Amino acid sequence: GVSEAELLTKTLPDILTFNLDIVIIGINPGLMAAYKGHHYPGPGNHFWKCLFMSGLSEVQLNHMDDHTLPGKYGIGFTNMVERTTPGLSSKEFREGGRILVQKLQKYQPRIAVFNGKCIYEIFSKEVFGVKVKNLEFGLQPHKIPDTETLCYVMPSSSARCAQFPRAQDKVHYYIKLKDLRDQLKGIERNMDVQEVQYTFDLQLAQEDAKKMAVK
């Protein structure tokens, strides 16, 4: 009734606190993530599934549990671009990077986890200036300026990621992140069964991804 001011653009608040072990960084929250008010809502994203299959979460969690992550798991969330608009500017990435680095320099998590090569490639050029030649997934040779925060890169958790079609094809990076996290805090996990490597065939992976989809 009286008053019609519902706007289309909506912002998904960051989930950041001091002393976090991990902060998941994305380019920009999706429309549903902003409207639902939670990070990485399904379907079409492998984040929450990967979090569980890697052993980073005790049980299978979902977007509704994002606010419990800092306290229970030492994990937080933030993005390069804060506002989510339905349906990519250079300036936005420029001003975005400055604000992002500023949040990191403020909260200083132990590890800055970049969700996707793209976000890191943008961040690397704007903050480190470097254009990154032959970028490799995993720990990077840079810390966030003015901090002890490490930079860790993993393939995009979005199902749209073509190089790694299935959640299973991304889990190994979450496992190694868990390892890094453990070593940093002095947590001595059991070395009885260690996952050394994961190798997959792209063609079969994308076909398999499709089949899983229709079902």
């Binding site: 069964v193 050394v196 997959f200």
Partner: protein, 76 residues
Amino acid sequence: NDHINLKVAGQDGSVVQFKIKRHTPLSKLMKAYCERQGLSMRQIRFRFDGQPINETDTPAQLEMEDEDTIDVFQQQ
């Protein structure tokens, strides 16, 4: 009771390599595989040298060597 590497090859072209102690039950490797692959242990069968792997076997008991490969089938 040293460590050895074992690969687990599925029918989807993927190969997962694990490091495990010779006297550790393979049941632990099979569970880790199912968990990371997001598969249920009920609909999965592991085999080595054409023989089913029971829950109590260990690499030593099966005389497995470094870099041996385990076959896995999805009973779907």
